């Protein structure tokens, strides 16, 4: 908190104060043009890629490492095949340009100097809530700084950072210095809890991005939440077992029950295909529209989730604090406001589908092909 607190946020906050409905409604929109996509092999990135191809006209440059594969072109085609039935190889080389590189190497952007990019969408990130080393800050902060530096070699390149609602992490740890504190799309710093490495890293990427805006860079920060399976067909991420949220669902299923604090917990189910649609729509908003809370606003409860699980016959029951506390041993967020983004998204013809029972069954059906609940 040396690097965090020893920082004058006055300029940043003055920008954030332009991020109002009046300034969206009266502002002049931006065009996507050609996109440079980082993170194109991840769960969110590969769906941004899909939506771009399905509903925008430009090219999209995908920075990735060849890895074990022969060419980075072949790696990308393997990932798209893994996620979509459509074959997309015909577009590779014309609309999808694969690019060998890693956002932690500033030199890996130099090859893009002569290409016509208008927009950088940075969805590459290391999301590991517990890590014992500092490589998370290479990917999440330094990879952002490297992209911002690429964007600043020009005057016509937007930078769109994919951030996390979790930067609004807690009540203030200094209510005295932050009275009447709001938690919305005009908030970045209010001495919240930043002890967690992942949250601290995304916080420092946002601060870097908004700092670049004070120097003239057109930027957007899109805070996403609980990234869940596609709405169209319930397909989840290829590494299905790293998700803590669904892991707790799997514990409650194996324990056979949950206390009513668990049943009452409300969550967003931001369906990954709709997160991608939303990222591409908010990228066209006027320049003073800089920060967005892009998450399904129709929260559901764990009562709703287990209700859908119980259609499989798991008989998960809601016990009491005592009853539950016995079956185990045998083995602020409401304050966070997202209404301004919901309004902007609505005006752009975007409405979050409800995480209803039929969608939860689509989601659980896919998980069950991996015997996730067996």
Automatic annotation (TrEMBL):
According to the lineage, what is the superkingdom?
Archaea
Which residues are listed for (R)-4'-phosphopantetheine binding in this entry? 127-129, 242, 244
Span-the-membrane segments of this chain are none
Protein name stated in the entry: Non-ribosomal peptide synthetase
């Amino acid at each position: 908190d040396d690097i965090i607190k020893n920082y004058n946020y006055g300029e940043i906050n003055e920008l954030l104060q332009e991020n109002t409905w009046e300034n969206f409604f009266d502002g002049e929109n931006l065009e996507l043009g050609n996109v440079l996509l980082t993170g194109a092999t991840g769960f969110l990135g590969i769906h941004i890629l899909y939506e771009f191809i399905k509903s925008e006209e430009g090219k999209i440059y995908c920075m990735l490492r060849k890895g074990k594969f022969d060419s980075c072109q072949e790696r990308l085609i393997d990932v798209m095949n893994d996620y979509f039935d459509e074959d997309f190889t015909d577009l590779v080389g014309s609309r999808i340009i694969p690019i060998e590189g890693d956002i932690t190497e500033i030199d890996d952007f130099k090859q893009l100097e002569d290409e016509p990019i208008d927009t950088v969408i940075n969805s590459a990130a290391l999301v590991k809530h517990y890590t014992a080393d500092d490589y998370i800050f290479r990917v999440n902060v330094d990879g952002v700084i490297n992209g911002l530096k690429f964007a600043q070699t020009r005057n016509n390149i937007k930078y769109v950072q994919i951030s996390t609602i979790s930067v609004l992490s807690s009540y203030s740890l200094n209510e005295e210095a932050y009275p009447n504190q709001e938690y919305d799309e005009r908030t970045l710093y209010y001495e919240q809890d930043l002890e967690n490495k992942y949250v601290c890293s995304k916080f420092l990427a946002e601060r870097a991005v908004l700092q670049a805006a004070t120097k003239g860079l057109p930027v957007k920060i899109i805070r996403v939440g609980n990234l869940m399976s596609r709405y169209s067909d319930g397909v989840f991420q290829k590494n299905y077992d790293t998700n803590a949220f669904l892991n707790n669902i799997k514990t409650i299923k194996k324990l056979g029950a949950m206390n009513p604090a668990m049943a009452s917990e409300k969550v967003d189910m931001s369906q990954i295909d709709y997160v991608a649609k939303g990222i591409l729509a908010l990228s066209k908003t006027p320049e003073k529209s800089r920060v967005f809370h892009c998450m399904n606003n129709h929260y559901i409860s764990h009562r709703d989730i287990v209700d859908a699980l119980n259609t499989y016959g798991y008989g998960i029951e809601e016990v009491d604090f005592e009853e539950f506390k016995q079956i185990y041993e045998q083995n602020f967020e409401e304050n966070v406001e997202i209404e301004q983004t919901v309004d902007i998204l609505h005006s752009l013809g975007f409405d979050w589908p409800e995480a209803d029972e039929e969608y939860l069954k689509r989601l659980f059906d896919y998980l069950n092909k991996f015997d996730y609940f067996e």
